[PDB]
Design a protein around this ligand. Structure first.
Ligand SMILES: *[C@@H]1O[C@H](CO)[C@@H](O[C@@H]2O[C@H](CO)[C@@H](O)[C@H](O)[C@H]2NC(C)=O)[C@H](O)[C@H]1NC(C)=O
Ligand SMILES: *[C@@H]1O[C@H](CO)[C@@H](O[C@@H]2O[C@H](CO)[C@@H](O)[C@H](O)[C@H]2NC(C)=O)[C@H](O)[C@H]1NC(C)=O
Ligand SMILES: *[C@@H]1O[C@H](CO)[C@@H](O[C@@H]2O[C@H](CO)[C@@H](O)[C@H](O)[C@H]2NC(C)=O)[C@H](O)[C@H]1NC(C)=O
Ligand SMILES: *[C@@H]1O[C@H](CO)[C@@H](O[C@@H]2O[C@H](CO)[C@@H](O)[C@H](O)[C@H]2NC(C)=O)[C@H](O)[C@H]1NC(C)=O
Ligand SMILES: *[C@@H]1O[C@H](CO)[C@@H](O[C@@H]2O[C@H](CO)[C@@H](O)[C@H](O)[C@H]2NC(C)=O)[C@H](O)[C@H]1NC(C)=O
Ligand SMILES: *[C@@H]1O[C@H](CO)[C@@H](O)[C@H](O)[C@H]1NC(C)=O
Ligand SMILES: *[C@@H]1O[C@H](CO)[C@@H](O)[C@H](O)[C@H]1NC(C)=O
Ligand SMILES: *[C@@H]1O[C@H](CO)[C@@H](O)[C@H](O)[C@H]1NC(C)=O
Ligand SMILES: *[C@@H]1O[C@H](CO)[C@@H](O)[C@H](O)[C@H]1NC(C)=O
Ligand SMILES: *[C@@H]1O[C@H](CO)[C@@H](O)[C@H](O)[C@H]1NC(C)=O
Ligand SMILES: [Zn+2]
Ligand SMILES: [Zn+2]
Ligand SMILES: [Zn+2]
Ligand SMILES: [Zn+2]
Ligand SMILES: [Zn+2]
Ligand SMILES: [Zn+2]
Ligand SMILES: [Zn+2]
Ligand SMILES: [Zn+2]
Ligand SMILES: [Zn+2]
Ligand SMILES: [Zn+2]
Lengths: 324, 324, 324, 324, 324
């Protein structure tokens, strides 16, 4: 039964060098706050118990089944599900005892996206591989990451990748940290351009005379169009506890402005139908509405330039598993 | 074959200490009444049959396969599906016989959400781990829960977590109870603000003269917009047998009010087209409609402050499995 | 190899007592005609070959792996997929040879819903557990069902549950029959109330004068709203070969009535624009339309009270597998 | 190792009689061109090596595990995925060596639907079970199909089922061919009735005077409604390379007719606003439009009665695997 | 343990001839940039260690389990998931040692679609089978591809298929390259025809007199219809980092043109309501708008004829795994 036990390096723990290849990051679901990726793990260690004399066996390398020798059972905390593409992998051992294991896996880890600057949000995602069955006094990890992404024409671009070993740990683990940036133009063209166009159309329609029947229908049809667009936006975005995207607030403000414009138009038209004072009030409100639209644009730009997504760290991140 | 039998503690049943780490609760589907979570179970017990003399074996801890020793087969009643991230886990046994087993799993349990106060609903979810293959006279559980959630910026926040052992049980089991509260602003901004804005717009449009063609089209377009919004809301919410969300009732009342306003406007305009009495009736109806809108808002607020979701307990909850 | 053979009861077949616990019925997909449920099967039988003397073995009960002894391989015909939550279950055997096996499974069986009275449809669902590997002369089943549903606040309520053993069978099987009733208010509030409100609005708008431009736009906007509502309804319901829901027919009739009203309004307005006769025709058509709407409501109520869903039995139900 | 080898029938290949029970065909996804079904395969053959003397063993039938004897490994070419409901099935062998194997499986095969006559499309679906590990000189199949469908109230009805053995084959295989016919009324009521109603409404609205403001809005609102309906239809149907459904062409023609009517109305109203000649042109265009609508209906009916879906056979169907 | 080791060809590496049958390519998800396919791999090699004398064993071919002999463990880098339809396949070995292995698998690989010319996009997809457990000095692959696609009536047509062995490789691998072309008419009829029709309708409605109330509502209703169509298009297409489809840009330009037309109409109508100069400005703008629409059509045609999708190669494609 000793063949499946972890090799002894002596006083120091056994060293396992892990090479991580990020084949692709294909799914980035902000609604579920999940990131799906494909990884290749090449784990190399030394097991002198498996060394054999070259004279007896002419082969310079042999393949052993996954359960015939000690292999580090890696577990990912953030991964919703892990699909190992090799159900029964094999370990390659040479005459000097160096064991190499290749594992191809697909995971859907949990990533805490910072959606404050949607659709240009920048987030940090982490994949923490833990060897729960072992202890830090027996197992040590050296993690290297190679950026071998095969799909680059995606909405989210992985530009920074690195590996680290959290110090002062009880469970031996290594963390692969990558950075996601959104470069998709679908959201912008889909929502922002129609929203700004509708706002400009409402501002222009404010110039129609107060006693024109063609104005109320115009305003209400624009209001319905913006309601549909706002519903599409809000259903296309998730809601956070504290740090929500600024786009939902901006669209809410614009929708309130459009509702205020429609309400003012209808109220003043009704009062007029009952230069007259309502027409002067309409002109003053039109000037104030144009000024308010410009001020709202400038204020939102300033907020975007000086916004802070200051959500507190999660209990798992504040106290990582297997620390101290 | 005795190596896989449950260890004997004597007259008292064997004690297994279970430490539960809630890594994340990522999916909360009110439509399916399901809650998906990731858990790490650390089960520690004593098996003196596995103890070995330290002189013979220099190792202070060994790893055994899942099927080479007795391990408690845990089953979750509420879980729609259980995905164990380790198909063949290993148990760590030291020289004194203390066996530790780490199991990482992902489940989609069934949670009875109290959706009465949507979108601020507060619910209790339960995960009951049962050892169906054993009996209470042989197995005992001590359950501890650690709140190590890695994703805190979610729509639903897990704020209270605890563990318990239901007394007077035949099947040894332990229950992990957590509390979910909804803090998502997506539903509010998506539906309530547009609904209130449309209601206010309809009230304001009630001030238009009865003999204005611009009024009927205005009312009908607002009615169509609110129909679309109501359809979106009802398709965005599930239906319960007795305790339904108050939002669907509130939106139904508002939709009926808008339909009544449109019907009154059209009927009075038609009768006028056939101060005249219909205009006086329109003014009286406008005053009554404003008063009724305010009264409906106050009544709904009072109902929300004094509503009771008094759904009877389910047969499974009333009579838990493996009791008496 | 005899340890995995079915125990011999003698001339009579072996008796296996099955206790079925219905933990939850969570998904009821009328579109796919599927019902998903979670079940716990407790199968108890007698295997005297496994009995041991209490003097030799102090244990009063032992656990054996799933493949170390004969266990009935149960197969569900209606189940689209079966997920056994215990991949390698264990059987508990006492000193007297009584073997007990607990199996927790999740299935998505096929249920023939009677959607004639949607959204108040009442249907019978069946789960037929077959022991295909055995014969009726060797295996017999006693099935008991316990209603331990943990989720009661669902759209569909399971109120009647029972078990039966189909007589004159070649393959030993037992059938669990449950009854589903729909109590969801989502469909009603979503569709019926807006549909009736739109119909009443169209009837009221029929009172507008024939030579009013505000009438045609009103009618067409209501027609568009009802077209959207009808599309939502038909996409929210499945289509059967013969016994379709009465709601689709009712909405089709109402849509045809609205189209007829709009067509009459437009035709008469055009003819008038080319007391005049078209106005008298419009008044007569309005009276006939109100009478027809009331008659349609009464006729649909009568049909609902006296409708028969007389779909012929399926070939599988007419000739169950393993009969005669 | 000879116990897992295929039994020798002599010069002639071994004969395996396969009985196929089609429990249900639940999913028919025209968008993915897939058909999901549940099947029970009863494979009976003769293995004289497993025969035993009745005097030694009193049992008249024994059960052996799936890997303890030779069993034909069946593979389905068209199946996207195969879910065997029995992971480790058992084979029943009597004293005379007759081995019977029952396999319950669920598959999602690829079916080439002939969607030319949607929603009344008639298609042929095929499930080809191949024994890739064997050769035709060693294995032979006799396939029988029993129509035991448990769900008959579906959109698609399976009315013809048969089995065949493709002659001149290298890989022993048997093909189960079924015929699907669509009887769903959801598509018809959802799309065709509203489309015809909107077309009739547009024809009737063509009678409005050219100098009426109520006509342009009427035409444009009908155009928007038909645009929504056409979008729903095209998103509810898939696109083929050559043989597309005639419904998409019919709806495209109707949409072009509605656009032409709206364009003519607007152009003539504008020219008139700048008996007058535009009114005479409008009357002539109305007559021509009614005649063209009737002619389009008749032409589409004739095309439907004399349409040929002449898509060439796929390379897989033209040259089946394991032929010659 | 030597029975599972790779056979030795001598100084030269072992040669494995791989025959690839592409049964079907059923899913092409541009949103996820994925291509799903079904493949049959026939791997033939020589293992003289398994040869046996024909005199001792009369059988000319035997079947061995997957784990009883050396088989190349193939891994696909681009595949999101691999479903092997045979969990425990068998290898056929004749008396001369020629081992043949048949593997039926279904994969969802990652394909970098060139969506510049949507919906007539042409893309290259690759499936790279890697033998990670072996080295190039021990294993060599000869790959042959047979186009046996069973479903030809799909949106995407596979017209070119080939196999290659990347030279100067450390990990033995073979790449199957296929070409996808889109022939679906669903996108064209769904979006382009309604978009062009709406643009033509807006151009025609520009001819309405500036002082007509029927013009503003017409323009705004067309604007709402095109907003809905544009939203449908953008939600029906994915967004790339650099090389986006030209259709989204074209629809954005058309939407901006429609917004400009509506804004000009409303502004000029308002200024007129406060030959007059606004009417002359409206006529000049109408001429300029027609000229601009024609110029935009010609410019987009020229761009389509002279567009370059020059996205840089992904890091995985630039540096393939196991090279040098
Ligand atoms: C046993 O422990 C020693 C020290 O922990 C390891 O030696 C280290 O190897 C790494 C190579 O990545 C070097 O960076 C360090 O400088 C080395 N430290 C010392 C003190 O030598 C050694 O690799 C371990 N051996 C095994 C088989 O794990
Ligand atoms: C055997 O049974 C005894 C009593 O049931 C267990 O002793 C208890 O251990 C817990 C530690 O969590 C204490 O809280 C109790 O106070 C103890 N009770 C007594 C009477 O000592 C003991 O742990 C069990 N031993 C094993 C191996 O399970
Ligand atoms: C062997 O067969 C006999 C008869 O079929 C079984 O005895 C029956 O047990 C049930 C208990 O549920 C009783 O309801 C019947 O009245 C009994 N019938 C008779 C004639 O005794 C017996 O249980 C079977 N034994 C085993 C181990 O299966
Ligand atoms: C061995 O081969 C012979 C001939 O191929 C098989 O005999 C046939 O069995 C079928 C029964 O379905 C009959 O329809 C044929 O008429 C028979 N042909 C002859 C020449 O007899 C025989 O079944 C095979 N035996 C086994 C065990 O496979
Ligand atoms: C051992 O190596 C030699 C050379 O690499 C292989 O011989 C080649 O076989 C292919 C057949 O596809 C021919 O195209 C080459 O021309 C051959 N080259 C030479 C030098 O003969 C041989 O097939 C290998 N044997 C095994 C069992 O793998
Ligand atoms: C993401 O990582 C970078 C450095 O790697 C750091 O500067 C930044 O603060 C991180 N952002 C968040 C939300 O953690
Ligand atoms: C939820 O739990 C708290 C205490 O833990 C309790 O007060 C409350 O009544 C529970 N609510 C429901 C619906 O069970
Ligand atoms: C359902 O079951 C009840 C009795 O259990 C029976 O009266 C009724 O006819 C059944 N309905 C159908 C559609 O089978
Ligand atoms: C389908 O099968 C019938 C006979 O079984 C045949 O007449 C018909 O041509 C087939 N249709 C297609 C598209 O293969
Ligand atoms: C696709 O393959 C063909 C030749 O096989 C090549 O000419 C073309 O440049 C390739 N296109 C891309 C985007 O790689
Ligand atoms: Zn080495
Ligand atoms: Zn930013
Ligand atoms: Zn210990
Ligand atoms: Zn509350
Ligand atoms: Zn007993
Ligand atoms: Zn009923
Ligand atoms: Zn027999
Ligand atoms: Zn036909
Ligand atoms: Zn050979
Ligand atoms: Zn091109």
């Amino acid at each position: 039964q000793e063949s499946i036990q972890i090799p002894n390096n002596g006083s120091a723990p056994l060293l396992v060098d892990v090479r991580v290849f990020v084949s692709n990051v294909f799914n980035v679901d902000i609604l579920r706050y999940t990131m799906s990726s494909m990884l290749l793990l090449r784990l190399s260690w030394l097991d002198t118990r498996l060394a054999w004399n070259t004279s007896a066996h002419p082969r310079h390398a042999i393949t052993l089944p996954w359960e015939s020798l000690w292999t580090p059972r890696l577990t990912i905390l953030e991964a919703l599900w892990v699909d190992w593409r090799d159900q029964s992998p094999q370990a390659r051992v040479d005459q000097d005892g160096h064991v190499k294991l290749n594992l191809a896996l697909a995971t859907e880890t949990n990533c805490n996206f910072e959606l404050l600057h949607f659709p240009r949000d920048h987030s940090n995602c982490s994949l923490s591989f833990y060897a729960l069955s072992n202890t830090a006094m027996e197992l040590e990890f050296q993690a290297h990451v190679v950026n071998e992404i095969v799909s680059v024409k995606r909405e989210y671009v992985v530009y920074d990748l690195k590996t680290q070993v959290p110090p002062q740990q009880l469970v031996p683990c290594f963390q692969v940290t990558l950075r996601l940036k959104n470069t998709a133009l679908k959201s912008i063209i889909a929502l922002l351009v129609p929203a700004e166009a509708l706002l400009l159309a409402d501002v222009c329609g404010g110039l129609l005379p107060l006693r024109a029947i063609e104005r109320i229908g115009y305003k209400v049809t624009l209001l319905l169009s913006y309601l549909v667009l706002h519903s599409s936006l809000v259903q296309a975005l998730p809601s956070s506890s504290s740090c929500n995207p600024l786009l939902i607030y901006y669209f809410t403000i614009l929708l309130l402005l459009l509702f205020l414009s429609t309400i003012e138009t209808v109220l003043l038209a009704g009062l007029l139908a009952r230069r007259s004072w309502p027409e002067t009030a309409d002109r003053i409100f039109f000037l104030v509405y144009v000024v308010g639209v410009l001020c709202t644009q400038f204020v939102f730009a300033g907020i975007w330039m000086w916004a802070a997504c200051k959500s507190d760290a999660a209990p798992g991140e504040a106290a990582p598993h297997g620390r101290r």
